[PDB]
Ligand binder design. Structure first.
Ligand SMILES: CCCCCCCCCCCCCCCCCC(=O)OC[C@H](COP(=O)([O-])OCC(O)COP(=O)([O-])OC[C@@H](COC(=O)CCCCCCCCCCCCCCCCC)OC(=O)CCCCCCCCCCCCCCCCC)OC(=O)CCCCCCCCCCCCCCCCC
Ligand SMILES: CCCCCCCCCCCCCCCCCC(=O)OC[C@H](COP(=O)([O-])OCC(O)COP(=O)([O-])OC[C@@H](COC(=O)CCCCCCCCCCCCCCCCC)OC(=O)CCCCCCCCCCCCCCCCC)OC(=O)CCCCCCCCCCCCCCCCC
Ligand SMILES: CCCCCCCCCCCCCCCCCC(=O)OC[C@H](COP(=O)([O-])OCC(O)COP(=O)([O-])OC[C@@H](COC(=O)CCCCCCCCCCCCCCCCC)OC(=O)CCCCCCCCCCCCCCCCC)OC(=O)CCCCCCCCCCCCCCCCC
Ligand SMILES: CCCCCCCCCCCCCCCCCC(=O)OC[C@H](COP(=O)(O)OCCN)OC(=O)CCCCCCCCCCCCCCCCC
Ligand SMILES: CCCCCCCCCCCCCCCCCC(=O)OC[C@H](COP(=O)(O)OCCN)OC(=O)CCCCCCCCCCCCCCCCC
Ligand SMILES: CCCCCCCCCCCCCCCCCC(=O)OC[C@H](COP(=O)(O)OCCN)OC(=O)CCCCCCCCCCCCCCCCC
Ligand SMILES: CCCCCCCCCCCCCCCCCC(=O)OC[C@H](COP(=O)(O)OCCN)OC(=O)CCCCCCCCCCCCCCCCC
Ligand SMILES: CCCCCCCCCCCCO[C@@H]1O[C@H](CO)[C@@H](O[C@H]2O[C@H](CO)[C@@H](O)[C@H](O)[C@H]2O)[C@H](O)[C@H]1O
Ligand SMILES: CCCCCCCCCCCCO[C@@H]1O[C@H](CO)[C@@H](O[C@H]2O[C@H](CO)[C@@H](O)[C@H](O)[C@H]2O)[C@H](O)[C@H]1O
Ligand SMILES: CCCCCCCCCCCCO[C@@H]1O[C@H](CO)[C@@H](O[C@H]2O[C@H](CO)[C@@H](O)[C@H](O)[C@H]2O)[C@H](O)[C@H]1O
Ligand SMILES: N=C(N)NC(=N)NCCc1ccc(I)c(Cl)c1
Lengths: 100, 98, 83, 48, 347, 307, 174, 171
C-alpha cells in the first residue's frame, strides 16, 4: 500500500503543479516521414538490441551463488563477448559513423 | 478457471482482432502485434508463478527478448516501406497483386 | 616476437582505450584458470545451507553420519573459518 | 579488501542461515497445527 | 551481401530449422521459428527494390502472427497440463490454435494468399528456400502433434489447398507464381495423409522438395522467371528443355516417373482406412496441376516458340551458373519409381 | 504517519532544487571572478523565491495535442520524485528488495517526457531536437546499466541498503574507480549537463517551463546521491542514524557541486563526438570491465552473500 | 475492495488493449500500450513476480516501447489525429468497452460467468499458495538458473541477438 | 471421493512457545544443540510421511522440548539472555554481528551454569541420523498399482518374408 500511496502522491502533486501553473489570475479584459534520417533509427534499434542483452545479464549477481560456477562463468563471458562482437561488427561496418 | 485468466485471454483476443483488422498505418498493426506479446507474457508469468514452476521463471524473459528482437525487425521493414512511399500505409504494398 | 612488440606499441600509441579493453577482457577469461583461490568459490557456495538438512533414518550402518550436530562426523567448515 | 570482507559476510550469512535451520522444526510443528485447526474450523461451519 | 555474412545467415536459417527438429521443449520450438524467420528476411530483401520490400513485409506479418498463435497454444497447453514437452497437446483449443498457426506458416489454404505474392517478389534462390527448406520445420511439428489434431480441420485444410492450388495455377504466366500455387496443392497431399500415416507425409515432402529444387535450379540456370522467357530455352540449351519436360511430367504425377510415387502411396494408405471418396477427389483434382504443367511443356519443349535476333549472341557463351546438384536432382526427380519400397527407411 | 513521511521527502526535494539554482549561480560566479546573486536577500538567499514567483505569474505562452502537452511535464516531475523513495539515507521510505532495478526501470521511462514534448511542440524542428536528445539519453543508459551490474557483482543483490553493508570497511570507488569514472561522466551525459548540454547548445545555434526545470534539477541531485551510495558508501550506526545522514549529505553536496565545477571548466561536445565517446570508448571499456568483474569475485573467492 | 486488486488491474488491462486495438493514431495507440504495459506489470507483481514485473518496465516499456515511439515520431506520425474522431475507431472502441463492462458486471454479480468458457469469480486470491517461509525469492532462483541449467538457452538466445544486429544492418543499408 | 479425515480441535491443543522471533533468534544456536533429537525425529516424520496429520505427537514433543529449554534459561540466565535478545530486537534485520558483546555474556552464562556449548560454524547445517521406532511408510504417495508394461518383444531377427511385399515388388 505504501508504494501505491507514494506513487499516487508524486504524480498527483505533479498534476496539481501543472494545474496552477496553467491557470492563475491574468488581470486583462481584452503524418509523413519527418525528414527521415536512417542513422538515428539505427541508434534506437542498436540500443534496443543491447538493452535485451542487458536483460539477460541482470541475473548475474544471483547466478554467482550457484555451485555450477564452471558453467555459469563460461556462459556469462560468452554472452558479454557476443555483445562485444555485435559492437565490433557495427563498428567495422560503419554503423557508428555520423558522416554521409 | 481463475477470474484473471478471463481478462488476459480477452486481451489477447482483442489484440488479435486488432491485428487482423488492418486500417492504414502499418505501425498500428505492429502495436497490436506487441500487444499480443504483452498478454502472452502476463499469462505465462501468472501460470508459472502461481504453480511455483521454478525453472520456468526464465521463460517470460526469453519470450520478451525474442519478441523484442522480432519487433525490431518489423520496425526496420516499416522504415524501409516509409522510405519508399513516404508513409507506412499498407495500401501501398500492393505491387505483388500482379 | 619483435613484430609482435612493434604492433603492440602502435596500438598503444593510437588506440590505448581499445588496448586496455582487450587486455582486461583477456585477463577475465584467463585468470580464473590460473588462480589458486577459484576452488574456494565452489566450496563456499556449496557450504551455504539454503534449505533444511533433512535427517537420515538410522539403519545402524552409517558410522560416517553424525548423530548430533556437534558430533565430529560430517563436513567441517574449519577451512572456511581460517579463510 | 573486498575479498576479505565478502568472505566474512559469507560466514555471517551461514551463521544466520543456521539459526533459521535450528528454529525450522519448531515453526514447522506450529504451522501444521495452525493449518489443521483452520481446516477443522472450516469443517464445523460447513456441517452447519 | 558480403559472402561470409550470406553464409552465416544461411547457416542461421538452417540452425533455426534444426532447433525445431531436435527440440523436446515447446519454447525451443518457438525459438527455432523465431531465429529462422529473422535470418530469412535478409535474403528476401537482398535485391533492394519495392517488390522485395513488400514481399519481406507481407512475409514478416504472416509469420509473426502465426508465431504469436503458436505461443498461445503452448501457453494454453502449459495451463492445462503443466508441462512443455513437444508431443500431443492436452487441450482442443490449443490444438486448433497450433494447427492453424502451422497451416499459416506452410501457406495452406485459406491462409495461402501470401505464398504467390512473396515468392513472386523475391529472387529465384530465395524462393527456392521459401518453398522447400521452410516447409521442414512446420511439417516436423505436425509429425509429432498429429494424434491431437482435429481430423475435420486438417482434412478441410488439405482439401482446400488442393483445390486452391490447382485452380490458382491455371491463371499464371509467372513461373514463381506457378511454383507457389503448385506448392500449395502439394502441401494438401502431405497433410491429408498425416492423420493416417505420417511416414507417407515424409515421403511426399522429400520427393516434393527434390522436384521443386530441380525446377528452381533449372529456372536459375537460364535466369527465366516468365513463361515466354522460358520458351526461349530451346534455342539456347536444348538439353534443358528435355530435363524440364521430364521434371514437369513427374510433378504431374505421371507414371513411370518419381512424382507418381507419393500420390500412389497416399491413395493406398487412405484406402486401407476405408477413405475412398477423399483420395478419389484428390486424385481427380490434381489433374488441374497436370494441366498447367503440360502447358509449360508445350511452350518449352514440345513446340518451338519464336526467337529474337539478339539470341544469336548468346550461342557463343557457355553456362557459368553453378547448377549445383542438378544432374543428381533431375535423375531422382524422374527415375526413382522402381525403388519405391525404399520408403521404409523413413519409418 | 506514512503520508507525513512522504511529504517530509517531497517538500525538501523541491526546496533543495530551488536553492541549487542559487548555489550554481554563485559557484559559477566565483569561478568566473564575480559574485553571482547577492542583492535579492542577503547573499542572494531570496533569489530562488523571486525567480519562482516571477515564473509562475508570467504569461503561460498552439500545442499539436493537448493531452501530450500536459502529460510530458507531469511525467517528468512525477518520475523524478519517484526516484527518491527507495534511497536509503540511511533508511529508505520504501524498502525494496530490488530497489536498484526499480531505479533503473523508472529512469528508463524519463525519456518519454522528452519524446512527448517533442510531439506536442507542433514544430518539425522541435521534434527533431527531441529525437536527438532521446538518442543521446538511451545511448548512455547502456553503459549506466552495465556499470551498475558490474558494481552489484561485489554487493550481491539489488537492494540499495546492501551497498551500505558492502562498503562497511572501504568505499567501492577503490576497487572500481575505472567504473566510477565512466559512471560519473555517464550521469552528466544522461542529465544533458555540460559538456553534454546539447539540447540547450544546439537549440540556440512560465510555470510549465519551471516544472521541467525542477524535474531536471531534482534528477541531478538524485544522480549524485546515487553516486555517493554506489561508490562512496557512508557507514551506518543504527543507534545514531543522523551521523550517517550528515556524512552522506556532505558527499552528495560535493558531488553535486562538482557538476557545477565541470560546467564552468570545459567546452561542449559535438553531437557525433559524444556519441563516439559512448559507443567507441565507454562501451568497449564497460564491456571488458563487466567481464572482469564477473570473473574477479570467482577467482578471488570473494563472492558476496545473496542476502 | 483491495482483495480484488488483480481483477481490477486485469479489467484496466483489457480497456487499454481496446484502446490501441481499435487503432487510433499510432501516437495514441502507443500511449494505450504503455498504460497496458504498466498495468500488466502490476498484475505480475501481485503474483510474486517482482523481477518479471520490473522487466516489463525496464525492457518492454523503457526499451521496446521507447523505440516504437521514436520510430513513430520519425517515420509514421508527427502530429496525432484527434482521438476517436474517426467513426470506425470510435465504434470499435465503444464496442469493446461495452463487452468488457458486461463481462465485469456479471462476474461480480454472480461471482462466476460463462463467456464461451467457465470462469470463477470469487477473486484470484483463492488459488494462492498457503505455505511460504523460504529465505530466498523463488522467482530469482529460477531466473538465476539460466546460467547453470540453461546453457543451451543462452547459446541460441545470444546467437539470435547477434544475428539481429547483422540482419537489421543488412535490411536498412539498401 | 471420500472424506478428508481431520484431527479434532482437542487433539491439536498444546502449550505454545509464545516468544517473539528475536528471542528465538537469540536462543537459536543453543536451542539447536539442546533440542536436536526431538526436533530431528519430528522432521524425519514430516519428510517421510508427507502428511501433517501423521506427526502431531512428534510435533507436540518439539514444543515440550522448547518450553523446557526456555525454562532453563529463565531459571539461570534470565538477565544476560534478556539483554542479548533485546540487542537483537533493535535491529531491523536482527543481525548477530551487532551484538557480540551481549552474546558473549549470554554464552558465558549458559556454559557456566548449564554446560551448554554454542555449536560451531557449519554444525547445525549437517545432515544427521535419527533412530526412530516409527515404521518406515510403505506407500507414502498412496499410489495405485502401476499399469502393466506392454508385452515385450524377444526373438531372432530374420529377413522379411518375401521382402517388402509391396504390390508387385519381389524383394
Ligand atoms: C539410393 C537412392 C538413389 C541414389 C541416391 C544417391 C544420392 C546422391 C549420392 C551423391 C552424389 C553426389 C555426386 C557424385 C560426385 C559427382 C561429381 C564429381 O565427380 O565431382 C568430383 C570432384 C570435382 O568434380 P568437378 O570437376 O568439379 O565436377 C563437379 C560435377 O559437375 C558435379 O558438381 P556438383 O555441383 O553437382 O556437386 C557435387 C558434389 C560436390 O562436388 C564435389 O566436390 C564431389 C563430392 C562428391 C562426394 C560424393 C560422396 C558420396 C559418398 C557419401 C558418403 O556434391 C557433394 O558434395 C555430394 C554431397 O572431385 C573431387 O574433389 C572428389 C571429392 C573429394 C572429396
Ligand atoms: C471478444 C472478441 C474481440 C472483440 C473486439 C471488441 C472491440 C475491441 C477492438 C478490437 C479491434 C477492432 C479493430 C477494428 C478495426 O480497426 O477495423 C477497421 C476496419 C477498416 O478500417 P478503415 O480503413 O477505417 O475502413 C473502414 C471501413 O472498413 C470502410 O472501408 P472501405 O474503404 O472498405 O469502405 C467500403 C466498406 C464496405 O462495407 C460493406 O460493404 C460491408 C457490408 C456487409 C453487410 C453484411 O468496406 C468495409 O466495410 C470492409 C469490411 C466489410 C465487412 C467484412 C466482412 C466481415 O473498419 C471496420 O471494419 C470497422 C469494424 C469494427 C467492428 C469491430 C467488431 C469486432 C468483432 C470481431 C469479431 C469477434 C466476434 C466474437
Ligand atoms: C552391374 C552388374 C551387377 C550384377 O552383377 O548383377 C546384375 C543383375 C543380376 O542380378 P541377379 O541376382 O542375377 O538377378 C537378376 C534378376 O533378373 C532379377 O530378379 P529379381 O527376383 O530380383 O526381380 C527383379 C526385382 C528387383 O528389384 C527391383 O525392383 C530393382 C528395380 C529394377 C529396375 C529395372 C529398370 C527398368 C525399369 C523398367 C523399364 O524387381 C522387382 O521386384 C519389381 C520389378 C521392378 C521393375 C520396375 C518396374 C516398377 C516401377 C515402374 C516404373 C518403371 C517402369 C518403366 O542384372 C540385372 O538383373 C539387372 C537389373 C536391372 C536394373 C539394373 C540395370 C539397369 C537397367 C536399366 C534399364 C533402363 C530402362 C530403359 C527404359
Ligand atoms: C535435396 C535437394 C538439395 C537441393 C540443393 C540445391 C542447391 C542450390 C541450387 C544450385 C544452383 C546453384 C546455386 O548456387 O543455387 C542458388 C542459390 C544461391 O543463390 P545465388 O543467386 O546463386 O547467389 C547467392 C549469393 N547471394 O543456392 C542457395 O542459396 C541454396 C538454396 C537451396 C537450399 C534448400 C535446398 C532444399 C532443402 C534440402 C534438404 C533436403 C531434405
Ligand atoms: C510511470 C508510473 C510509475 C509506475 C510505477 C511502477 C511500480 C513498480 C513497483 C515495483 C517495485 C517492487 O518490486 O516493489 C513494490 C512491491 C513489491 O516489493 P518488493 O520488495 O520488490 O517484494 C515484496 C517484498 N519483498 O510491489 C507492490 O507494492 C505491488 C504494487 C502493485 C500495483 C502497481 C501497479 C502499477 C501500475 C502503473 C500503471
Ligand atoms: C579529481 C576531481 C574530480 C571531481 C569529482 C568530485 C569529487 C567529490 C567527492 C566528494 C566526496 C569527498 C568525501 C567527503 C567526506 C565527507 C565527510 C565524511 O564523510 O568523512 C567520513 C570519511 C570516512 O567515513 P565513511 O565515509 O563512513 O567511510 C567508511 C566506509 N563506509 O572520511 C574520509 O574522508
Ligand atoms: C595496458 C596495455 C599495455 C600494452 C600491451 C598490452 C598487450 C595486450 C593487449 C593486446 C590487445 C591488442 C588489441 C588492440 C586491437 C586494436 C585494433 C585497432 O586499432 O582498431 C582501431 C580501428 C578503429 O579505429 P577508427 O577510428 O575507426 O579508424 C582510425 C581512423 N582515425 O579498428 C576498429 O574498427 C576497432 C576494432 C573494432 C571494435 C572492437 C571493439 C572491441 C570490442 C569491445 C569489447 C572489448 C573487448 C572485449 C570486452
Ligand atoms: C566466443 C565464445 C567465448 C566463450 C568464452 C568462454 C571463456 C571461459 C573461460 C573460463 C572458463 C572456466 O573458468 C574457470 O576455470 C577453472 C579451471 O581450473 C575452473 O576450476 C576452478 O573452479 C572449480 C569449481 O567449479 C574447482 O573445482 C577447481 O578446483 C578450480 O580450479 C573454474 O571452475 C572455472 O570458473
Ligand atoms: C481463435 C481464438 C484465439 C483466442 C483464444 C482465446 C483463449 C482460449 C482459451 C481456451 C482455454 C479454455 O479451454 C477449454 O476450457 C474448458 C474448461 O474445462 C475445457 O473443458 C470443457 O470441455 C471439456 C470437454 O470434455 C470438459 O472439460 C468440460 O465439458 C468443459 O469444461 C475445454 O476442454 C477447453 O477447451
Ligand atoms: C508561487 C506563488 C505566487 C503567488 C503570487 C500571487 C499573485 C497573484 C496576482 C498575479 C498578477 C499577475 O499580473 C499579470 O500577469 C499576467 C501574466 O500573463 C500579465 O499578462 C497578462 O496581461 C497582458 C496585458 O496586460 C495580456 O496581454 C496577457 O495576455 C496576460 O497574460 C499581466 O501583464 C500582469 O499584469
Ligand atoms: N541555471 C541557473 N542555475 N540559474 C537559473 N536562472 N535557473 C533557473 C531559475 C529558476 C527556475 C525554476 C525555479 I522553482 C527557480 Cl527557484 C529558479
Amino acid at each position: 500500500m505504501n508504494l501505491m500511496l507514494a506513487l499516487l502522491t508524486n504524480f498527483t502533486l505533479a498534476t496539481l503543479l501543472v494545474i496552477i501553473a496553467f491557470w492563475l489570475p491574468q488581470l486583462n479584459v481584452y503524418s509523413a516521414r519527418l525528414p527521415f534520417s536512417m542513422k538515428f533509427f539505427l541508434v534506437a534499434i542498436t540500443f534496443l538490441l543491447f538493452d535485451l542483452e542487458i536483460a539477460l545479464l541482470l541475473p548475474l549477481p544471483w547466478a554467482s551463488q550457484t555451485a555450477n560456477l564452471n558453467t555459469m562463468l563460461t556462459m556469462a563471458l560468452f554472452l558479454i563477448i557476443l555483445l562485444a562482437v555485435s559492437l565490433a561488427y557495427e563498428w567495422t561496418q560503419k554503423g557508428l559513423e555520423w558522416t554521409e | 478457471m481463475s477470474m484473471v485468466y478471463m481478462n488476459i485471454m480477452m486481451a489477447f483476443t482483442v489484440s488479435l482482432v486488432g491485428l487482423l483488422m488492418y486500417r492504414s498505418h502499418l505501425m498500428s498493426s505492429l502495436l497490436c502485434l506487441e500487444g499480443m506479446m504483452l498478454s502472452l507474457f502476463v499469462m505465462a508469468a501468472l501460470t508459472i508463478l502461481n504453480s511455483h514452476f521454478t525453472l520456468a521463471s526464465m521463460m517470460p524473459i526469453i519470450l520478451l527478448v525474442f519478441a523484442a528482437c522480432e519487433a525490431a525487425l518489423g520496425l526496420s521493414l516499416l522504415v524501409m516501406v516509409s522510405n519508399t512511399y513516404g508513409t507506412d500505409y499498407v495500401q501501398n504494398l500492393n505491387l505483388l497483386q500482379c | 616476437a619483435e613484430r609482435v612488440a612493434a604492433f603492440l606499441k602502435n596500438v598503444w600509441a593510437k588506440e590505448p582505450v581499445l588496448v586496455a579493453s582487450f587486455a582486461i577482457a583477456g585477463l577475465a577469461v584467463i585468470l580464473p584458470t590460473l588462480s589458486p583461490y577459484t576452488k574456494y568459490s565452489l566450496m563456499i557456495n556449496r557450504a551455504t545451507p539454503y534449505n533444511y538438512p533433512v535427517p537420515l533414518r538410522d539403519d545402524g550402518n552409517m558410522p560416517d553420519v553424525p548423530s548430533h550436530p556437534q558430533d565430529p562426523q560430517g563436513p567441517s567448515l574449519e577451512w572456511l573459518k581460517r579463510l | 579488501s573486498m575479498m576479505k570482507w565478502n568472505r566474512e559476510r559469507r560466514r555471517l550469512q551461514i551463521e544466520d542461515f543456521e539459526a533459521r535451520i535450528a528454529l525450522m522444526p519448531l515453526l514447522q510443528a506450529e504451522k501444521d497445527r495452525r493449518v489443521l485447526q483452520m481446516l477443522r474450523e472450516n469443517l464445523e461451519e460447513e456441517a452447519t | 551481401m558480403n559472402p561470409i555474412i550470406f553464409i552465416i545467415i544461411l547457416l542461421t536459417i538452417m540452425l533455426g530449422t534444426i532447433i525445431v527438429m531436435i527440440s523436446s521443449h515447446w519454447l525451443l520450438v518457438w525459438i527455432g521459428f523465431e531465429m529462422n524467420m529473422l535470418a530469412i528476411i535478409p535474403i528476401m530483401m537482398k535485391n533492394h527494390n519495392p517488390r522485395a520490400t513488400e514481399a519481406s513485409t507481407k512475409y514478416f506479418l504472416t509469420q509473426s502472427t502465426a508465431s504469436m498463435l503458436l505461443m498461445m497454444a503452448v501457453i494454453i497447453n502449459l495451463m492445462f497440463s503443466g508441462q512443455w514437452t513437444v508431443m500431443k497437446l492436452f487441450n482442443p483449443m490449443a490444438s486448433m490454435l497450433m494447427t492453424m498457426a502451422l497451416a499459416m506458416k506452410l501457406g495452406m489454404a485459406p491462409f495461402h494468399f501470401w505464398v504467390p505474392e512473396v515468392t513472386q517478389g523475391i529472387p529465384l534462390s530465395s524462393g527456392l528456400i521459401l518453398l522447400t527448406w521452410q516447409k521442414l520445420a512446420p511439417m516436423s511439428v505436425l509429425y509429432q502433434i498429429f494424434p491431437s489434431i482435429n481430423l475435420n480441420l486438417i482434412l478441410t485444410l488439405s482439401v482446400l489447398s488442393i483445390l486452391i492450388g490447382g485452380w490458382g495455377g491455371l491463371n499464371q504466366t509467372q513461373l514463381r507464381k506457378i511454383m507457389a500455387y503448385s506448392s500449395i496443392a502439394h502441401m494438401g497431399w502431405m497433410t491429408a495423409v498425416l492423420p493416417y500415416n505420417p511416414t507417407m507425409t515424409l515421403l511426399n515432402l522429400i520427393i516434393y522438395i527434390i522436384m521443386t529444387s530441380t525446377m528452381f535450379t533449372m529456372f536459375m540456370a537460364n535466369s527465366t522467371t516468365t513463361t515466354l522467357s522460358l520458351s526461349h530455352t530451346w534455342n539456347k540449351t536444348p538439353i534443358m528443355t528435355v530435363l524440364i519436360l521430364a521434371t514437369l511430367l513427374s510433378m504431374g504425377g505421371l507414371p513411370p516417373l518419381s512424382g507418381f510415387m507419393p500420390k500412389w502411396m497416399i491413395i493406398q494408405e487412405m484406402t486401407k482406412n476405408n477413405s475412398i471418396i477423399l483420395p478419389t477427389f484428390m486424385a481427380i483434382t490434381a489433374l488441374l496441376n497436370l494441366y498447367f504443367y503440360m502447358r509449360l511443356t508445350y511452350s518449352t519443349t514440345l513446340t518451338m516458340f519464336p526467337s529474337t535476333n539478339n539470341m544469336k549472341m548468346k550461342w557463343q557463351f557457355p553456362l557459368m551458373k553453378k547448377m549445383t546438384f542438378l544432374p543428381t536432382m533431375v535423375v531422382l526427380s524422374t527415375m526413382m519409381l522402381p525403388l519405391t519400397p525404399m520408403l521404409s527407411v523413413l519409418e | 504517519m506514512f503520508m507525513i513521511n512522504i511529504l517530509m521527502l517531497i517538500i525538501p526535494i523541491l526546496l533543495a532544487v530551488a536553492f541549487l539554482t542559487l548555489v550554481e549561480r554563485k559557484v559559477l560566479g566565483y569561478m568566473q571572478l564575480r559574485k553571482g546573486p547577492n542583492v535579492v536577500g542577503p547573499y542572494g538567499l531570496l533569489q530562488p523565491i523571486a525567480d519562482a514567483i516571477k515564473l509562475f505569474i508570467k504569461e503561460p505562452l498552439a500545442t499539436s495535442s493537448a493531452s501530450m502537452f500536459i502529460l510530458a511535464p507531469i511525467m517528468a516531475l512525477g518520475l523524478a520524485l519517484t526516484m527518491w523513495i527507495p534511497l536509503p539515507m540511511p533508511y529508505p521510505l520504501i524498502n525494496m528488495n530490488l530497489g536498484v532495478l526499480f531505479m533503473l526501470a523508472m529512469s528508463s521511462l524519463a525519456v518519454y517526457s522528452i519524446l512527448w514534448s517533442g510531439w506536442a511542440s507542433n514544430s518539425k524542428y522541435a521534434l527533431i531536437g527531441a529525437l536527438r536528445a532521446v538518442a543521446q539519453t538511451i545511448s548512455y543508459e547502456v553503459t549506466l546499466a552495465i556499470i551498475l551490474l558490474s558494481v552489484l557483482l561485489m554487493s550481491g543483490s539489488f537492494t540499495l541498503s546492501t551497498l551500505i553493508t558492502t562498503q562497511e570497511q572501504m568505499w567501492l570507488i577503490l576497487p572500481a574507480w575505472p567504473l566510477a569514472m565512466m559512471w560519473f561522466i555517464s550521469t552528466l551525459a544522461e542529465t544533458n549537463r555540460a559538456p553534454f548540454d546539447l539540447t540547450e547548445g544546439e537549440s540556440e545555434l512560465a510555470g510549465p517551463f519551471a516544472l521541467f526545470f525542477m524535474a531536471e534539477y531534482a534528477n541531478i541531485i538524485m544522480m549524485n546521491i546515487f553516486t555517493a551510495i554506489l561508490f562512496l558508501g557512508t557507514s551506518h550506526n543504527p543507534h545514531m542514524p543522523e551521523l550517517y545522514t550528515i556524512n552522506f549529505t556532505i558527499k552528495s553536496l560535493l558531488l553535486t557541486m562538482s557538476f557545477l565545477w565541470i560546467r564552468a571548466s570545459y567546452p561542449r561536445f559535438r553531437y557525433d563526438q559524444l556519441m563516439h565517446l559512448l559507443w567507441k570508448n565507454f562501451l568497449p571499456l564497460t564491456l571488458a570491465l563487466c567481464m572482469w568483474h564477473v570473473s574477479l569475485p570467482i577467482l578471488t573467492s570473494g563472492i558476496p552473500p545473496q542476502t | 475492495m483491495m482483495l480484488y486488486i488483480v481483477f481490477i488491474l486485469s479489467v484496466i488491462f483489457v480497456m487499454g488493449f481496446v484502446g490501441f486495438s481499435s487503432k487510433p493514431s499510432p501516437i495514441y495507440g502507443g500511449l494505450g500500450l504503455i498504460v497496458s504495459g504498466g498495468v500488466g506489470c502490476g498484475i505480475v507483481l501481485n503474483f510474486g513476480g517482482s523481477f518479471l514485473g520490473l522487466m516489463v518496465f525496464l525492457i518492454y516499456l523503457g526499451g521496446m516501447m521507447v523505440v516504437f515511439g521514436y520510430t513513430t515520431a520519425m517515420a509514421t506520425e508527427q502530429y496525432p489525429e484527434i482521438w476517436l474522431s474517426n467513426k470506425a475507431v470510435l465504434g470499435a472502441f465503444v464496442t469493446g468497452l461495452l463487452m468488457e463492462f458486461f463481462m465485469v458486471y456479471y462476474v461480480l454479480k454472480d461471482k462466476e460467468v460463462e463467456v464461451v468458457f467457465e470462469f470463477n469469480g470469487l477473486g484470484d486470491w483463492v488459488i494462492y499458495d498457503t505455505g511460504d517461509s523460504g529465505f530466498f525469492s523463488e522467482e530469482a532462483m529460477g531466473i538465476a538458473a539460466l546460467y547453470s541449467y540453461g546453457t543451451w538457452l543462452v547459446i541460441v538466445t545470444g546467437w539470435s541477438l547477434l544475428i539481429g544486429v547483422v540482419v537489421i544492418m543488412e535490411i536498412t543499408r539498401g | 471421493p471420500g472424506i478428508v479425515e481431520l484431527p479434532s480441535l482437542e487433539d491439536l491443543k498444546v502449550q505454545e512457545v509464545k516468544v517473539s522471533s528475536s528471542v528465538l533468534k537469540a536462543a537459536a544456536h543453543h536451542y539447536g544443540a539442546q533440542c536436536d533429537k526431538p526436533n530431528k525425529e519430528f522432521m524425519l516424520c514430516r519428510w517421510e510421511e508427507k502428511d501433517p496429520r501423521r506427526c502431531l505427537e512428534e510435533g507436540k514433543l518439539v514444543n515440550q522440548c522448547a518450553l523446557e529449554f526456555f525454562r532453563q534459561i529463565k531459571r539461570h540466565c534470565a538477565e544476560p539472555f534478556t539483554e542479548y535478545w533485546t540487542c537483537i530486537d533493535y535491529s531491523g534485520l536482527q543481525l548477530f554481528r551487532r551484538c557480540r558483546k551481549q552474546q558473549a555474556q549470554f554464552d558465558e552464562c549458559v556454559l557456566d551454569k548449564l554446560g551448554w556449548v554454542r555449536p560451531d560454524l557449519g554444525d547445525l547445517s549437517k545432515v544427521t541420523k535419527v533412530k526412530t521406532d516409527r515404521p518406515l511408510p510403505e506407500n507414502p504417495y498412496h499410489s495405485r498399482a502401476r499399469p502393466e508394461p506392454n508385452p515385450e518383444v524377444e526373438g531372432d531377427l530374420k529377413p522379411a518374408r518375401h521382402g517388402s511385399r509391396l504390390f508387385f515388388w519381389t524383394m
